[PDB]
Ligand binder design. Structure first.
Ligand code: 4ER
Length: 208
């Protein structure tokens, strides 16, 4: 059973802007996704301080970067708080409608696409390098779900079974044909060192 949803007009317009605007500095997508993973890990850590049973679904707090040259995918995995089905549908737990407006108002005031994360819509920078994004998530209070979108104004949500993750989120970037540099170990290392060198969780770059 697959449910299909329309993006709010402002988010569809943001995604169109990210896909169609000429902007060479695409590598910033990884900083944005690692930042989101770090925020999610902070949230489950904070909840666990008063309720240790919140970590029964996994005590390890980490971020994994997994490139797959055969599938042409780059996956960002974390063991953070994860998201409920309601969160996924409601713009992946964000205020993306007001965030998009604040980003647009900033772009007109002298901002560039690299400042997208300041407006709480950094996730959508994934569409700088991906033709499709799959978000697999598991929150302690809900079942495992898969969100997916190839932009075009809609996203899908379905239950995800067979590979239970315990708790957290997996962001699967199905890369554009001309963006395979983001599967290369030296390129990922370079971007992590440049933009995410002080993240407070272990970042493990998987090899093939
Ligand atoms: N890694 C991760 N974990 C959560 N909980 N939310 C996010 C998130 C935050 C904002 C927009 C989109 C996503 Cl997928 N990412």
């Amino acid at each position: 059973e697959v449910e299909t949803f329309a993006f709010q007009a402002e988010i569809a317009q943001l995604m169109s802007l990210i896909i169609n605007t000429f902007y060479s500095n695409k590598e910033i997508f990884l900083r944005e996704l690692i930042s989101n993973s770090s925020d999610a890990l902070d949230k489950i850590r904070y909840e666990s301080l008063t309720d240790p049973s919140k970590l029964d679904s996994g005590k390890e707090l980490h971020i994994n970067l997994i490139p797959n040259k055969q599938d042409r995918t780059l996956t960002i995995v974390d063991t953070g708080i994860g998201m409920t089905k309601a969160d996924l549908i409601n713009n992946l737990g964000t205020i993306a409608k007001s965030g998009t407006k604040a980003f647009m108002e900033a772009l007109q005031a002298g901002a560039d696409i690299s400042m997208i994360g300041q407006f709480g819509v950094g996730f959508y920078s994934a569409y700088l390098v991906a033709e499709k994004v799959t978000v697999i998530t598991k929150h302690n209070d809900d079942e495992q779900y898969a969100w997916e979108s190839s932009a075009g104004g809609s996203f899908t949500v379905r239950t995800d079974t067979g590979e239970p993750m315990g708790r957290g989120t997996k962001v699967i970037l199905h890369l554009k044909e001309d963006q395979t540099e983001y599967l290369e170990e030296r390129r990922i290392k370079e971007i992590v060192k440049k933009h995410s060198q002080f993240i407070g969780y272990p970042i493990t770059l998987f090899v093939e």
